[PDB]
Amino acid sequence: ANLAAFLTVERMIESAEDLSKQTEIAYGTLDSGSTKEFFRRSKIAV
Amino acid sequence: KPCDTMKVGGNLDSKGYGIATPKGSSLGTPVNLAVLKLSEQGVLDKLKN
Amino acid sequence: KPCDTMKVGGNLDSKGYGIATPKGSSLGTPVNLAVLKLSEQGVLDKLKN
Amino acid sequence: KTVVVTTILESPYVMMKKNHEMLEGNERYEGYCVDLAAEIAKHCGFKYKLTIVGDGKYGARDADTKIWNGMVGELVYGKADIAIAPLTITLVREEVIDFSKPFMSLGISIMIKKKPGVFSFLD
């Protein structure tokens, strides 16, 4: 039964929202770049 | 639906849809800036969705 | 290598790298045509590969 | 006639050759942007000299000083004439300089740190 569970399950954070939710993990960008400006001038909630 | 067909493989070339105007139109200059302002605002993503 | 890192998720936004020139440069007009000629020829795909 | 070409060492776009201590001229630089600039100058016929930015920054503006840094500051302030580089298009930079049609598309993404045993049958 347990072998089957291993194989069955095997057959099944990975997005930006999951990153914004997690504050323990630290994320950053280049200091002077389109990425920082894009985040700064953005209007989306995430 | 009906979903009677499918897309296969990858994109042969990459291009983009672009607003057009006749040579010397006064609209040409502002349409570029309008597109960039919409891109900053994220409007195009909302319309696409 | 070393491939000790990985990409996660998909692309949040779409943008494009673009050659730049100062306002009023005489090179700006021809560089656009050079870029379009390369795109049509498919040189950029070969360089990318 | 010769063009002042601005770039940054962001592989594989621009990267120095092996044993570059003895490499000089435009030959010391190899990459994708250097090739692209080659064919741009070929089709235009112009001449180009590959130059790096000391500040080593792609470019941005200080919302308080209204000053431009990196490639954009260089081109707007006259220290150069063109940027065959991995520079990204955006609204703010277009207001002050003229871009071309994109030569490659991209998107933001996230980077993170990343075999059956012989006796796996006992697992």
Curated annotation (Swiss-Prot), chains B, C:
Tissue expression summary: Detected in forebrain. Detected in dendrites of neuronal cells. Expressed in the pyramidal cell layers of CA1 and CA3 and in the granule cell layer of the dentate gyrus.
Induction: Down-regulated in the pyramidal cell layer of CA1 in the hippocampus by global ischemia.
Site feature: Interaction with the cone snail toxin Con-ikot-ikot: 37
Record's comment on post-translational modification: Palmitoylated. Depalmitoylated upon L-glutamate stimulation.
Places the protein is found: Cell membrane; Postsynaptic cell membrane; Postsynaptic density membrane
Family: Belongs to the glutamate-gated ion channel (TC 1.A.10.1) family. GRIA2 subfamily.
Miscellaneous comment in the UniProt entry for this protein: The postsynaptic actions of L-glutamate are mediated by a variety of receptors that are named according to their selective agonists. This receptor binds AMPA (quisqualate) > L-glutamate > kainate.
Domain notes: The M4 transmembrane segment mediates tetramerization and is required for cell surface expression.
Subunit details: Homotetramer or heterotetramer of pore-forming glutamate receptor subunits. Tetramers may be formed by the dimerization of dimers. May interact with MPP4. Forms a ternary complex with GRIP1 and CSPG4. Interacts with ATAD1 in an ATP-dependent manner. ATAD1-catalyzed ATP hydrolysis disrupts binding to ATAD1 and to GRIP1 and leads to AMPAR complex disassembly. Interacts with GRIP2. Interacts with GRIP1. Interacts with NSF via its C-terminus. Interacts with CACNG2, PICK1 and GRIP2. Interacts with GRIA1 and SYNDIG1. Part of a complex containing GRIA2, NSF and NAPA and/or NAPB.
Function of the protein: Ionotropic glutamate receptor that functions as a ligand-gated cation channel, gated by L-glutamate and glutamatergic agonists such as alpha-amino-3-hydroxy-5-methyl-4-isoxazolepropionic acid (AMPA), quisqualic acid, and kainic acid. L-glutamate acts as an excitatory neurotransmitter at many synapses in the central nervous system and plays an important role in fast excitatory synaptic transmission.
Designated name of the protein: Glutamate receptor 2
Organism: Rattus norvegicus
Lineage: Eukaryota, Metazoa, Chordata, Craniata, Vertebrata
Gene field: Gria2
From Swiss-Prot, chain D:
Residues involved in L-glutamate binding: 86, 88, 93
Record note on modification: Palmitoylated. Depalmitoylated upon L-glutamate stimulation.
Tissue specificity comment: Detected in forebrain. Detected in dendrites of neuronal cells. Expressed in the pyramidal cell layers of CA1 and CA3 and in the granule cell layer of the dentate gyrus.
Induction: Down-regulated in the pyramidal cell layer of CA1 in the hippocampus by global ischemia.
Residues the UniProt record annotates as site (Interaction with the cone snail toxin Con-ikot-ikot): 61
Location of this chain's protein in the cell: Cell membrane; Postsynaptic cell membrane; Postsynaptic density membrane
General function of this protein: Ionotropic glutamate receptor that functions as a ligand-gated cation channel, gated by L-glutamate and glutamatergic agonists such as alpha-amino-3-hydroxy-5-methyl-4-isoxazolepropionic acid (AMPA), quisqualic acid, and kainic acid. L-glutamate acts as an excitatory neurotransmitter at many synapses in the central nervous system and plays an important role in fast excitatory synaptic transmission.
Assembly, per entry: Homotetramer or heterotetramer of pore-forming glutamate receptor subunits. Tetramers may be formed by the dimerization of dimers. May interact with MPP4. Forms a ternary complex with GRIP1 and CSPG4. Interacts with ATAD1 in an ATP-dependent manner. ATAD1-catalyzed ATP hydrolysis disrupts binding to ATAD1 and to GRIP1 and leads to AMPAR complex disassembly. Interacts with GRIP2. Interacts with GRIP1. Interacts with NSF via its C-terminus. Interacts with CACNG2, PICK1 and GRIP2. Interacts with GRIA1 and SYNDIG1. Part of a complex containing GRIA2, NSF and NAPA and/or NAPB.
Other comment: The postsynaptic actions of L-glutamate are mediated by a variety of receptors that are named according to their selective agonists. This receptor binds AMPA (quisqualate) > L-glutamate > kainate.
Family as reported in the entry's similarity comment: Belongs to the glutamate-gated ion channel (TC 1.A.10.1) family. GRIA2 subfamily.
Domain notes: The M4 transmembrane segment mediates tetramerization and is required for cell surface expression.
Name this polypeptide is given: Glutamate receptor 2
